[PDB]
Structure to design on (1316 residues):
């Protein structure tokens, strides 16, 4: 019933910087044949985990040499020598000595960059859904960094947040920015009661909120 | 006018032209055109890629499956070993010499090659002799009240190694000599010149008696009596279908064995025998290119005849 | 009560992994097919029975033969070694069991007793001491004899089929025997009545042997499924089977601690299983025919295997 | 009898003395009585 | 004393090896057969005929034409034979005596199937010793084989067919049919040709051709 | 060495799940195979392992409902898991164990999402989202697709059949009455659209609905 508690929980790391990820089990673990099994798995968001270090310190074939595996007793550490775009993901330390075997809690490694203002665009309702009897107003908040962001929908100056459907994205590998969904789906008549809609966003890059609106009277 | 006499060698090719050289030195392209050594070497490589496969694979299979490890199979394991000697002492060093035109490893490498080659060939010969003797005693039942067990199989194998060394080793101590014969890429017994220091006359007669007349007489007598017996039995039980079948098959196999043995050895046998009774002679390329090639390839076509047709190796091919 | 399975109980135990046993000996000299074996308590002397009418007593350490007995009859299929090393026994389809004394006359050998009277073939005969012996008869009955008197001092009834094999408890007070009824039966050797019976098998129990603690045994079937039974459970605890080969099991025996259980098949091999987790711990290969019997030394240092190949192999 | 108790005594009897395994002390010619 | 015991052990191992070699050659020279057949089917009568020709288990032994023969008769043995009774693997042939008029045919078919289930007894010569052949021929005139199974040539054809249906080894398995005959002149030569054929077939099979 | 998994994407609650992870590149009798599931957006959980010789070791919680069996000849290992619940919605991974690397799981299965729900396979709906006259006044004009009312996961939305890779924004599906809605986006200048063809590829293999939409003005 050993638990792998991993630290640090989430640590921003610049490109090329070195990072230390150490995990210490709830109990001292050594296999009865004299070995100790700590294995470090890097998992991209939504993918299968990939092994980095087998047998505490040995790199597997194909594992980049920029990963350094070491540690003894209850302390184990993976060190990164050069951080590239492929370093984004979650890192788990795994023990294979005492069953049931357990994974680490995962470390959120993120890539820093210079601040960039979010891109806000609005979309007119699609003609096909208009034919089917629906109309969904779509607003996209693209490439805001860091995660800090606030969502507000305005309908001809009327505050609206009920019925708003939002989704959040992970930090991209190529651009290393956060994006968030803001789509409002409602009935035909409720969409028809108003002629314009306002999409209000709050971000740190500008003290003035970015605003976007579109006209229903134009297709 | 007859052949080229050397100290450490004897080349069966006349020096009256002044062309001949040592077989350890110059590529021998005045013995035969380089197209001839090209096809020769390629054909030798072919026989490498058939002989070493079968003969090594037999041992490997015997290692993997210990079911084949029975007393009766010992003389075939011996045969395989013999032919691998023929593979390395013969085919590999022939590759490394015919690629050049002349024998590279010195007269000491000549002794090593001649020894391991002749040892393999003689082990194969007596492996076939032992198989014939064993099958003769078991089926024909010549000896009154006798058995053939593992004691006899061990004595038989040991006897094949004793006799093989009793033939291959004397040229290493001073009774005949290993020299390049034929196309001068392969070293073998000096059967074609006289040399009182090495007692060639006594060695050839020794060869002729223990390793020719006795083996041919035993194989001919035994298989003749066996065929007579099987024919007589088939004659008497006219209505037994399976017996007529068995008759035909045994006779087929006996005929295969005899023809295999004649193809394998009567080239060398006839050449050596006519050398023996016709001391007044001198032979040319036609004969230096038929028995060493054709006789040596028996290292190929005895594994075919006795391994491939055997249904446990047809099931391995 | 099969409330769980052994693998569930031993879940927190790691496998021993690939067990690698080496060949230490190759006992050659037998002329015909070997059918039985038994270790002496000294782990040095062993007895082998072959159809050539021969019972040979070999010294394991020095690889040399110590005794060689020509039997009366060539149908021997069982042999046992006295714990004190003073006696040997042989027998088979001839319904007669011949017992020889060793430490009375040396060099030569004497047939101290011949047990005749059985109505069924002898499939297994086992010593208890220097004066008692249990024989397996295929008439659905077994027999306990006193060697000095030569009589069926006790008869074992309860099986409904031809008895193939038996094995004594390590303390030699209880023995389990299997017959053609696809059932195994536990017996007290002095009491000889069917206490517990185990059914479910599709064919004859071709193999049976005891666990070193004398609390469990194994069975071999024709469908290549070795089975582990407990004396008190009255039901199987583990099944060790391979589907791809349909040859039956011939003999079983356990390692000294019992972590490892040996069982040979007609597929020319024997499989040794991690008895705790049903894991195929290792494979013993090398016999030139089907395996006929095998055993472990009482001190457990090495295992001996006798097969139809007429050779015994010792593994460490 | 109940199988689980048999399983537990089985496991204890193994783990108490499973040490005769050559994977424990190795395969040495020196202390092996069955050597050449 | 230990060194003396070591040398004595080496010497006794050697002379035991010699004894085992000589015993093995002597035993392999003699040929054993297991005699079988239905109870009182004519096994004893054939035994008397063979004794005339040549001169719970029971043993018989004799010598003829330089070869030593020995047959053992199992007799009473209450066991499931069809399962494992094949432990006599290695015999030159399997001999069975049938009293022809005493038939049972389904039991014989089952026994044949049990023999066929053994791969080397699928390729093993089977000898049938037919006793009471005159009685069989006399009763078969008005009581055909339908007495046991609810024209001569075709009827024997389907008989051989249903015998051979499970047999896939026509080449390596031949039925050697013998009758009871007092005339020794034909008996000796036919015994000789039977043994000649069977040993030649066994040797050719040992040769590994097919 | 490759491990390939195949299984039913949607399974009714309390039924039996049969997952096959056909292995390659190694002898199945000499290596272990693992089972690990990952619920959406959570850390990994351990299920069990079958060892080289056929022995089994499971997670202490899941012996009773998990069954690992294999056919060594076909290089096929089968997971029989009974009494499924909604929490079983996860990407189930088969992971190899190499003894020579001493308990290191070199290779993991690609994973197959298994859904425990009563909803039926519903084909996806596609709508082209081109900016309107009020929304076309930006220096950069955004294009995308909305997928409303599909089931089950996943829909792999590729832009120009995967040839257009710059600026692709796919959003994770959002729970809406057990009907899942995801979105898509591109970042393209006014020169890219409508001058150059951009098509919207919606791939939903469950119903095999494949739609390619050239983006047109509203």
């Amino acid at each position: 019933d050993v638990l792998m508690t991993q630290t640090p929980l989430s640590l921003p790391v610049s490109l090329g910087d070195q990072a230390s990820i150490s995990c210490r089990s709830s109990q001292i673990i050594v296999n009865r044949n004299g070995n100790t099994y700590l294995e470090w798995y890097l998992q991209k968001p939504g993918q299968s985990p990939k092994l980095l270090i087998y047998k505490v310190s040995n790199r597997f074939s194909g594992v980049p040499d920029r990963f350094s595996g070491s540690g003894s007793g209850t302390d184990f550490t993976l060190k990164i020598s050069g951080v590239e775009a492929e370093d984004l993901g979650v890192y788990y330390c795994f023990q294979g000595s005492h069953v049931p075997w357990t994974f680490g809690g995962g470390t959120q490694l993120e890539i820093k960059r210079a601040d960039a203002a979010p891109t806000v665009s609005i979309f007119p309702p699609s003609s096909e859904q208009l034919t089917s009897g629906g109309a969904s107003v779509v607003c996209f908040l693209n490439n805001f960094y860091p995660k800090d962001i606030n969502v507000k929908w305005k309908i001809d100056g009327s505050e609206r947040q009920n019925g708003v459907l939002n989704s959040w994205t992970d930090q991209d590998s190529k651009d290393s920015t956060y994006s968030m969904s803001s789509t409002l789906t409602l009935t035909k008549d409720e969409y028809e009661r108003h002629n314009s809609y306002t999409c209000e966003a709050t971000h740190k890059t500008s003290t003035s909120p970015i605003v976007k609106s579109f006209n229903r009277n134009e297709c | 006018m007859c052949g080229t006499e050397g100290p450490n060698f004897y080349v069966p090719f006349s020096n009256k032209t002044g062309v001949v050289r040592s077989p350890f030195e110059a590529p021998q392209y005045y013995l035969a055109e380089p197209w001839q050594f090209s096809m020769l070497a390629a054909y030798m490589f072919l026989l490498i890629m058939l002989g070493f496969p079968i003969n090594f694979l037999t041992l490997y299979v015997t290692v993997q499956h210990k079911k084949l490890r029975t007393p009766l199979n010992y003389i075939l394991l011996n045969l395989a070993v013999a032919d691998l000697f023929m593979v390395f002492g013969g085919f590999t060093t022939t590759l490394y010499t015919s690629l050049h035109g002349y024998f590279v490893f010195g007269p000491t490498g000549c002794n090593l090659e001649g020894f391991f080659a002749t040892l393999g060939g003689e082990i194969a010969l007596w492996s076939l002799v032992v198989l014939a003797i064993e099958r003769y005693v078991v089926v024909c039942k010549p000896m009154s009240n006798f058995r053939f067990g593992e004691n006899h199989a061990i004595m038989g194998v040991a006897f094949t190694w004793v006799m093989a060394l009793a033939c291959a080793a004397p040229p290493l101590v001073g009774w005949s000599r290993y020299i390049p014969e034929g196309m001068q890429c392969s070293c073998g017994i000096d059967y074609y010149t006289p040399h009182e220091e090495t007692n060639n006359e006594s060695f050839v007669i020794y060869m002729f008696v223990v390793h020719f007349i006795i083996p041919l007489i035993v194989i001919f007598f035994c298989y003749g009596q066996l065929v007579f017996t099987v024919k007589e039995a088939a004659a008497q039980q006219q209505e037994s279908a399976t017996t007529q079948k068995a008759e035909k098959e045994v006779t087929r196999m006996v005929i295969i064995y005899v023809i295999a043995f004649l193809i394998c050895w009567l080239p060398y046998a006839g050449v050596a025998f006519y050398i023996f009774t016709h001391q007044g002679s001198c032979f040319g390329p036609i004969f230096m290119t038929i028995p060493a090639f054709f006789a040596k390839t028996s290292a190929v076509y005895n594994p075919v005849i006795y391994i491939m047709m055997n249904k446990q190796f047809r099931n391995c091919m | 009560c099969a409330d769980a399975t052994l693998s569930q109980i031993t879940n927190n135990i790691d496998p021993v992994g690939r067990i690698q046993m080496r060949t230490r000996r190759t006992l050659r000299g037998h002329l015909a097919k070997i059918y039985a074996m038994h270790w002496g308590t000294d782990s040095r002397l062993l007895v082998s029975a072959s159809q050539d009418g021969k019972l040979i007593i070999w010294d394991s350490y020095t690889t040399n033969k110590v005794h060689a007995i020509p039997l009366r009859s060539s149908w021997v299929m069982t042999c046992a070694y006295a714990p004190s090393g003073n006696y040997v026994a042989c027998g088979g389809l001839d319904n007669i069991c011949s017992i020889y004394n060793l430490k009375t006359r040396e060099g030569n050998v004497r047939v101290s007793r011949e047990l005749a009277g059985h109505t069924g073939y002898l499939s297994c005969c086992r010593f208890l001491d220097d004066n008692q012996i249990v024989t397996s008869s295929g008439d659905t009955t077994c027999a306990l004899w006193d060697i000095e008197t030569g009589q069926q001092t006790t008869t074992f009834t309860g099986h409904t089929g031809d008895v193939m094999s038996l094995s004594l408890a390590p303390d030699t007070r209880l023995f389990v025997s299997g017959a053609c009824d696809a059932s195994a039966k536990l017996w007290d050797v002095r009491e000889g009545m069917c206490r517990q019976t185990f059914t479910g098998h599709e064919s004859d129990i071709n193999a049976i042997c005891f666990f070193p603690n004398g609390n469990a045994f194994a069975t071999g079937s024709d469908d290549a499924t070795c089975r582990l039974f407990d004396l008190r459970a009255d039901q199987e605890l583990m099944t060790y089977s391979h589907d791809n080969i349909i040859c039956g099991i011939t003999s079983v025996s356990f390692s000294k601690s019992g972590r490892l259980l040996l069982a040979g098949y007609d597929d020319f091999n024997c499989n040794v299983w991690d008895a705790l987790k049903a894991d195929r711990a290792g494979v013993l290969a090398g016999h030139d025919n089907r395996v006929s019997c095998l055993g472990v030394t009482d001190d457990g240092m090495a295992v001996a295997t006798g097969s139809w190949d007429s050779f015994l192999k010792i593994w460490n | 009898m109940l199988v689980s108790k048999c399983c537990e005594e089985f496991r204890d009897y193994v783990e108490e003395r499973s040490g005769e395994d050559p994977l424990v002390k190795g395969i040495p010619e020196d202390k092996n009585p069955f050597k050449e | 004393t230990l060194s003396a015991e070591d040398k004595a052990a080496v010497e006794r191992s050697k002379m035991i090896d010699r004894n085992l070699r000589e015993d093995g050659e002597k035993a392999a020279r003699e040929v054993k057969l297991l005699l079988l057949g239905a109870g009182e089917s004519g096994k004893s009568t054939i035994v008397k005929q063979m004794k005339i020709i040549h001169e719970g288990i029971v043993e018989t032994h004799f010598t003829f034409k330089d070869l030593h023969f020995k047959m053992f008769d199992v007799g009473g043995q209450r066991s499931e034979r069809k399962k494992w009774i094949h432990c006599f693997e290695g015999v030159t042939a399997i001999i069975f005596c049938v009293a022809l008029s005493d038939y049972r045919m389904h039991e014989s078919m089952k026994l044949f199937d049990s023999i066929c289930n053994n791969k080397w007894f699928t390729d093993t010569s089977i000898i049938l010793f037919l006793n009471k052949k005159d009685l069989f021929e006399e009763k078969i005139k008005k009581s055909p084989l339908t007495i046991c199974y609810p024209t001569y040539e075709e009827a024997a054809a389907y008989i051989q067919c249903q015998f051979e249906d499970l047999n896939k080894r026509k080449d390596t398995k031949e039925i050697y049919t013998h009758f009871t005959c007092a005339t020794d002149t034909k008996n000796v030569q036919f015994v000789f040709d039977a043994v000649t054929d069977v040993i030649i077939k066994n040797n050719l099979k040992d040769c590994g051709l097919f | 060495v490759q491990l390939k998994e195949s299984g039913p994407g949607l399974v009714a609650p309390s039924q039996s799940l049969s997952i096959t992870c056909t292995v390659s590149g190694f002898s199945l009798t000499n290596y272990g195979v693992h089972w690990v599931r990952q619920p959406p957006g959570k850390g990994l959980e351990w299920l069990g392992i079958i060892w080289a010789g056929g022995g089994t070791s499971y997670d202490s919680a899941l012996m009773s409902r998990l069954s690992i069996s294999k056919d060594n000849s076909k290089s096929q290992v089968f997971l029989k898991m009974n009494s499924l619940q909604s929490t079983d919605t996860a990407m189930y991974y088969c992971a190899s164990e190499n003894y020579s690397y001493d308990r290191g799981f070199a290779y993991w299965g690609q994973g197959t999402l298994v859904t425990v729900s009563a909803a039926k396979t519903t084909p996806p709906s596609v709508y082209p989202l081109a900016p309107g006259s009020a929304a076309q006044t930006n220096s950069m004009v955004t294009l995308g697709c909305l997928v409303k009312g599909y089931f089950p996961e996943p829909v792999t939305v590729t832009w120009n059949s995967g040839s257009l890779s710059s600026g692709v924004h796919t959003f994770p599906a959002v729970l809406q009455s057990d009907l899942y809605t995801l979105s898509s986006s591109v970042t393209v200048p006014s020169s890219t659209w409508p001058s150059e063809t951009v098509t919207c590829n919606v791939a939903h293999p469950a119903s095999s609905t494949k739609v390619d939409k050239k983006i047109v003005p509203r």
